[PDB]
Design a protein around this ligand. Sequence first.
Ligand SMILES: Nc1nc2[nH]cnc2c(=O)[nH]1
Length: 334
Amino acid sequence: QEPLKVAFVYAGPVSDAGYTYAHDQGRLAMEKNLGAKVKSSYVENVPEGADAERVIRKLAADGNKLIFTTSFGFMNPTERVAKAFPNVVFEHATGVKLAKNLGVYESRQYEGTYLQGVLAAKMTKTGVIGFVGSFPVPEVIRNINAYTLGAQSVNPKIKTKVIWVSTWYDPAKERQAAETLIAQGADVLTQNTNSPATLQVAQEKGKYAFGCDADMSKFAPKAHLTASISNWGDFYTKTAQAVMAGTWKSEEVHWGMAEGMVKMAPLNAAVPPDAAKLFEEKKAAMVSGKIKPFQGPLKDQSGAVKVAAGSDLPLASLKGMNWYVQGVEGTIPK
Ligand SMILES: Nc1nc2[nH]cnc2c(=O)[nH]1
């Protein structure tokens, strides 16, 4: 068989050392695993809307038979190109739109974020943890709520302050947002943006933060408590193999810590032994499915019950999550 032409569309740069870096490490793992059977290429820094549609269409027109579109913002462009290219397989990250030649895939990174919350509660001195958000889409709201629930499993009085930058990647805006969270009393920060900017600010101010999608400890060795690492390579390999073998079908795929898509970086030396022990126990329980981030009981911020004790939040509620747990608030606007 001719080598399978595979293309990756990134919303950011491979030099983000975060989200796009991790997707690109997955492409390179697919190339290592499948060798001469695959020929990969990529496009970085692709904007949303008309630009994304033009890039995706050009890759399909040039003979790519499998195209990964790695941003939420590529959802509608991917759906429109997939209709025009019925002999090409499309895989869209974090989306909810499917077709005969369009699948969707995502990680359960919120499993990792829950464990970051457990550690944040152990390491905070203010009792206020902070979150740099991109856009209020379900991926990000699940991470905000999981961070908060993980912290509240240690200290039920924890408060989570959220600031929004309306971008997935802008190191200058991310830095400003991290400065504002620390000014408003957050002392352990996480994010759903894509740069190490928040970590660099945390180190400058003597605060803590987490790496996102990759180990970011080299950017901020004193501030980096751990990181929720995204391993896409096994998924990209499996998908490329399926297309080559004629077994591919449209489905919604979500992998977490049990499937190896989500891993934690080693703990910072500053984490005391009581905190490290709890973290390792909760990590083992998360991998085994003994605990789930959205196990009941859960209430929203209006006091409405979302999940009773002894139940887990349903898949439909996870997929569309647009509500907050008690203790989530915004920053005062600058
Ligand atoms: N985490 C995350 N980062 C992104 N960067 C650009 N698009 C995305 C996305 O959908 N999710």
